[PDB]
Scaffold this active site. Structure first.
Site, PDB file in Angstrom:
ATOM      1  N   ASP A  53       0.885  -1.176   0.000  1.00 35.18           N
ATOM      2  CA  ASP A  53       0.000   0.000   0.000  1.00 35.18           C
ATOM      3  C   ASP A  53       0.912   1.211   0.000  1.00 35.18           C
ATOM      4  OD1 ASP A  53      -2.340  -1.609   0.421  1.00 35.18           O
ATOM      5  OD2 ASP A  53      -1.669  -1.825   2.488  1.00 35.18           O
ATOM      6  N   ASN A  60      -3.223   0.272  -3.005  1.00 36.44           N
ATOM      7  CA  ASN A  60      -2.611  -1.042  -3.208  1.00 36.44           C
ATOM      8  C   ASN A  60      -2.087  -1.369  -4.608  1.00 36.44           C
ATOM      9  OD1 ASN A  60      -3.065  -4.282  -3.583  1.00 36.44           O
ATOM     10  ND2 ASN A  60      -2.257  -3.767  -1.564  1.00 36.44           N
TER      11      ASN A  60
END
Length: 130
Positions: A53, A60
């Site tokens: 992330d 992501n």
């Protein structure tokens, strides 16, 4: 960069985030706060699925940006994940907009559901002139 609350609120407003696809600025602030503490270089590796992330919105790598090391990943924002680690958040904002154009909208982020959905998020923009 670690933004101060109101600084970020105005920065997001100037970038066209206020009411984007029906999402208020206060919601984006609550998202940023809980995802990264308003920190653009925040990163979190997910050992389970080998994704990472990135940035202020913790976007992501499996679906949104390319880091070249996530198995079978796609790059829906057509950005290097490095673009999501810049002090200037324009590209991160472009990508966050891309995320919410999908079915889930702001619900794409589980942290928003946990800490912002059905909550009083007024506190996030009070006093910022937005």
């Amino acid at each position: 960069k670690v933004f101060e609350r109101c600084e970020l609120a105005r920065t997001l407003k100037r970038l066209g985030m206020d009411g984007y696809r029906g999402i208020s600025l206060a919601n984006w602030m609550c998202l940023s706060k809980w995802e990264s503490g308003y920190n653009t270089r925040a990163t979190n590796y997910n050992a389970g699925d080998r994704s990472t992330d990135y940035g202020i919105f913790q976007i992501n790598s499996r679906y949104w940006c390319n880091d070249g090391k996530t198995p079978g990943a796609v790059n829906a924002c057509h950005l290097s994940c490095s673009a999501l680690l810049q002090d200037n958040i324009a590209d991160a904002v472009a990508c966050a907009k891309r995320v919410v154009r999908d079915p889930q909208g702001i619900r794409a982020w589980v942290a928003w559901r946990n800490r912002c959905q059905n909550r009083d998020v007024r506190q996030y923009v009070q006093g910022c002139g937005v």
